[PDB]
Amino acid sequence: GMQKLTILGATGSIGASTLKVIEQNPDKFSVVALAADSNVEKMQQLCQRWQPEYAVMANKEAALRLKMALAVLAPNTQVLGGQEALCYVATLEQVDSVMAAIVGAAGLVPTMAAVKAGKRILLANKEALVMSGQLFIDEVEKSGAQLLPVDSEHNAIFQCLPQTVQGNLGRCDLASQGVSHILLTGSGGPFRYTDVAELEAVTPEQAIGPKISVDSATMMNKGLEYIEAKWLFNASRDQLKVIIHPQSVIHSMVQYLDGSVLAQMGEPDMATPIALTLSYPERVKAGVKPLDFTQVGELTFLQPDFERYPCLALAIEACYLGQHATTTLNAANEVAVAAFLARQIKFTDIARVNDSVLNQVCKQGLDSLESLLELDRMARTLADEVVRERA
Amino acid sequence: GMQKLTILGATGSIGASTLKVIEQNPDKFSVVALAADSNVEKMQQLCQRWQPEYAVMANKEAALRLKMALAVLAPNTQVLGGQEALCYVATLEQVDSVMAAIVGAAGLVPTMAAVKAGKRILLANKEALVMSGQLFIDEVEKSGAQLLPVDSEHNAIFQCLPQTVQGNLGRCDLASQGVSHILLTGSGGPFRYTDVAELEAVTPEQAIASMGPKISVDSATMMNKGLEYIEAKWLFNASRDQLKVIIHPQSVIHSMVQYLDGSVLAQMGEPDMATPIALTLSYPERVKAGVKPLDFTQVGELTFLQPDFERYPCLALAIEACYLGQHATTTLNAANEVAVAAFLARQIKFTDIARVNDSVLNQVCKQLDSLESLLELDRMARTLADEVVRERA
Ligand SMILES: [Cl-]
Ligand SMILES: [Mn+2]
Ligand SMILES: [Mn+2]
């Protein structure tokens, strides 16, 4: 059949890679809706090329401007505005799959909407599982929704697991299918070989979107992918290890009971993982060239040092404490990173802020997206506080 | 359900690795029969530990000595002798799987016997597919036999393929399951980085640089990789577009599969045949194999090289022979046995191996198949090669 898609977050690189896969397979995929935040210029250009039934801007004022643009550029496209409209396109009867690529907290509610409607979820929003993993997994089970991870690392892990595990994310019994270890890999960031002593003097210039680059330098991003992997693959602390792989040719790996390791590799292009999320359990052309082993260079590996990457230790800790600790850590880390970029704090202060905040909250019925959002707020003020003190 | 095994070639390193997996999983696997050639001392020790229902020595005189040893040490083990008995244990009703690990041409007939009986075949004999691939695949299809490859590279490829392909070896439609190509890897041998000019003066000492002496020379010339190439074609039903060769000097990666969407899967591991063998026993599940997990802190750097035919002319011959059919692959293999022995005996230079293979291959190709016709061919080609070696001096 023809697979029908809503793309939430169409104007970013995930959206672009998704559309490149769709362009390469026009007989298999079709765009019913596109959605974005406030980038009208990019949206109108997309809507012109794709002439979707719906187009949504989260920002109601941006929706108005798009509506007036598309009167000329895509006159059969119904433009809509606001949070309720994102849920509307995410839950349409005709839609099979939702690329859930709206970043941040704003992505929670419409991603959750697609989940409750039992859609196939191409998950590219970090926050669904970092903040509210237990809740997502539970709602996924309740509605029959299929969860297909888009992030390079989780997608790689998915490909290296056996089929029975792939079809059972959230609830999987890894040990009974022969899996010993999931090996989550990352480059280690620009300070992979920098002496721990020199981390205090690191400037924003050296550490480097800008927030995400700092999360790469501290490996707090990896910690976040760790938290997500735990929920996606139902993994204990011992089933889930982190390996530094500086060249990022290998994207992650799975260690089996019989000694066998499976690794996924590829050119650095999100169209590969996204293609598999669209096409699973089949494969499609993604407009990505085959890997050129002529150009790959040497592949090396390092065990991560927690003195160098104290944020990664915090995430892993937080991970097995539960939604409250992960929601807190993430909140605190947004604030600490902004504070570092503003020159209010040193590079190595980021982790201290994260650690201070994490300790305070953990001293204390059912969780909800709202209760956790309030928590995110609580933890944000606490972090704002700590930053003034360390200065 | 308890899986019941016959092990053909139990006294070698494949047999040992297989038994190590079985020892680790005594609740899943059980040894019905053990078979070997003429090493009675090793067999009696194995039969004492394992108390199999049957034990077979290919050599009838070795069978007699074993029979008398086992009358007390393993009193419920029926000892048997000869080629017919290898087939008998390979075709028993109670047996689910046959480890086909008798090497050389002698392994053909009993391996084929297990195939015709529709057994699960844990294939560890190179010759079945190098000499007689068309015939094996056809017989596999005809009886419902499952092929599970034991060689490290083919096993790796198998693990990197999707399930529908894995369950359809011999007949698989790779392109319809999203496979663009199979990437067969190898170390490139000790002349990895050696100037083509210096290959003429290479000595047996240098060519051998743990594995036997013939196989090490086939690793130096990449003729082994050509042989694995031939086998892969038949196992995975791979066209000329779908099968590639990559040098990977460290051999941490064992082989890989390139998919349509750009994704590559690779299989890696410690160099221990219990890993591949374990999967052949346990498929589609996994079992402990008594192999340690790979340690990435200790793996070192992983690199890749491009092979060139000036350095590895044998590889070009094998690939050529591959798509010419059983006659050419049977001939090449025969000729290469002789040329390698001739090199080790200091009769010919290292670089003469390929010439011998090439001379012989040309002669035969100027002119319905059976294991016997192909065995006769193997002998024809052997005499032709014996001839060419005298002339190169
Ligand atoms: Cl499972
Ligand atoms: Mn990443
Ligand atoms: Mn091999």
Q: Provide the CATH number for the domain around residue B93.
A: 3.40.50.720
H helices present in chain A, as ranges = 13-24, 40-50, 60-73, 83-90, 108-116, 127-143, 152-160, 163-166, 204-207, 210-217, 220-233, 271-279, 310-321, 323-341, 349-362, 369-389
Would you say how long chain A is, in residues?
391
The residues that bridge with A81 in the sheet, in sequence order, are A57
Contacts of B163 in chain A (CB under 8 A): 162-163
Which residue of A28, A238, A251, A260 is the best one to mutate when testing the B interface, meaning the one whose CB has the most B CBs within 10 A? A260
Domain boundary residue, one of B255, B285, B308: B308
Range of the domain at A30: 1-151
Exposure class string for A145-174: b at 16+ Cβ within 10 A, else e: bbbbbbbbbbbbbbbbbbeebbeebbebeb
Domain boundary residue, one of B282, B308, B334: B308
Same domain, B97 and B212: no
User: What are phi and psi for residue A10, nearest 5 degrees?
Assistant: -75, -15
Q: Which of residues 261-320 of A touch B (CB under 8 A)?
A: 261-267, 269, 271-273, 275-276, 279, 281-286, 288-291, 293-294, 296-303
The residues that bridge with A55 in the sheet, in sequence order, are A34, A79
The residues that bridge with A179 in the sheet, in sequence order, are A256
Which residue of B18, B255, B263, B305 is the best one to mutate when testing the A interface, meaning the one whose CB has the most A CBs within 10 A? B263
Task: Please indicate if the annotation marks A151 as binding a ligand.
Answer: yes
Contact A317, A223 (CB under 8 A): no
Domain boundary residue, one of A118, A151, A184: A151
Same domain, A254 and A224: yes
Q: Nearest-CA residue of chain B relative to A163?
A: B163
Measured in Å, residue A160 CA sits from the centre of ligand 1 at: 14
Same domain, B218 and B333: no
Contact B214, B307 (CB under 8 A): no
Q: Does A181 contact B293 at a Cβ distance shorter than 8 Å?
A: yes
The string of DSSP codes covering A246-286 is TT--EEEEEEETTS-EEEEE--S-THHHHHHHHHTTS----
Contacts of A260 in chain B (CB under 8 A): 159, 267-269, 275, 279, 286
**From its phi and psi, is residue B177 left (phi > 0), alpha (psi between -120 and 50) or beta?**
alpha
Q: Does B258 contact A181 at a Cβ distance shorter than 8 Å?
A: no
User: What are phi and psi for residue B94, nearest 5 degrees?
Assistant: -70, -20
**Which structure tokens are listed for B323?**
């798509």
Contacts of A163 in chain B (CB under 8 A): 162-163
Same domain, A261 and A336: no
Task: Please indicate if the annotation marks A143 as binding a ligand.
Answer: no
Measured in Å, residue B234 CA sits from the centre of ligand 1 at: 32
E-strand stretches of chain B: 3-8, 29-36, 54-57, 78-81, 97-100, 120-123, 146-149, 179-186, 243-247, 253-259, 264-268
Annotated binding site of B for Mn(2+): 151, 153, 228
**From its phi and psi, is residue A164 left (phi > 0), alpha (psi between -120 and 50) or beta?**
alpha
Indicate which ligand has the atom closest to the C-alpha of A153.
2
Contact of A257 with chain B, judged by CB distance below 8 Å, is answered with: yes
Task: Please indicate if the annotation marks A279 as binding a ligand.
Answer: no
Q: Does B287 contact A256 at a Cβ distance shorter than 8 Å?
A: no
Residues in chain B after which the chain is broken, C→N over 2.5 Å:
209, 367
Which amino acid type is present at position A188? G
Same domain, B180 and B230: yes
CA-wise closest residue to A275 among B314, B262, B393 = B262
Contact B342, B349 (CB under 8 A): no
Q: Which of residues 188-247 of A touch B (CB under 8 A)?
A: 243
Same domain, A195 and A333: no
Indicate which ligand has the atom closest to the C-alpha of A173.
1
Would you say how long chain B is, in residues?
393
Contacts of B272 in chain A (CB under 8 A): 259
CA B376 distance to own-chain centroid: 21
Experimental method: X-ray
Same domain, A4 and A123: yes
Same domain, A295 and A208: yes
CB-based contacts of A265, cutoff 8 Å, min separation 6: A249, A250, A251, A291, B256, B263, B264, B265, B266
Contact of B250 with chain A, judged by CB distance below 8 Å, is answered with: no
Q: Provide the CATH number for the domain around residue B383.
A: 1.10.1740.10
3-state secondary structure of B71: helix
Same domain, B168 and B191: yes
**Burial classification of residue A295, based on how many CB atoms lie within 10 Å of its CB (0-12 exposed, 13-18 middle, 19 or more buried):** exposed
Contact A153, A242 (CB under 8 A): no
| CA–CA distance, A189 with B349 (Å, rounded to integer) | 51
Contact A72, A48 (CB under 8 A): no
**Which structure tokens are listed for B300?**
């070192």
Q: In Å, how far is B185's CA from the nearest CA of chain A?
A: 12
H-run or E-run covering A243:
strand A240-244
User: What are phi and psi for residue B250, nearest 5 degrees?
Assistant: -85, -15
Give the CA distances from residue B315 to residues B187, B219, B229, B312, B318, in Å, rounded to whole numbers and listed in that order: 13, 11, 9, 6, 5
Q: Nearest-CA residue of chain B relative to A284?
A: B261
Same domain, B82 and B40: yes
Nominal resolution (angstroms): 2.5
Q: Considering its fold, how many domains does chain A have in total?
A: 3
Same domain, B101 and B130: yes
| CA–CA distance, B315 with B221 (Å, rounded to integer) | 8
Cβ atoms within 10 Å, residue B308 = 12
Same domain, A226 and A341: no
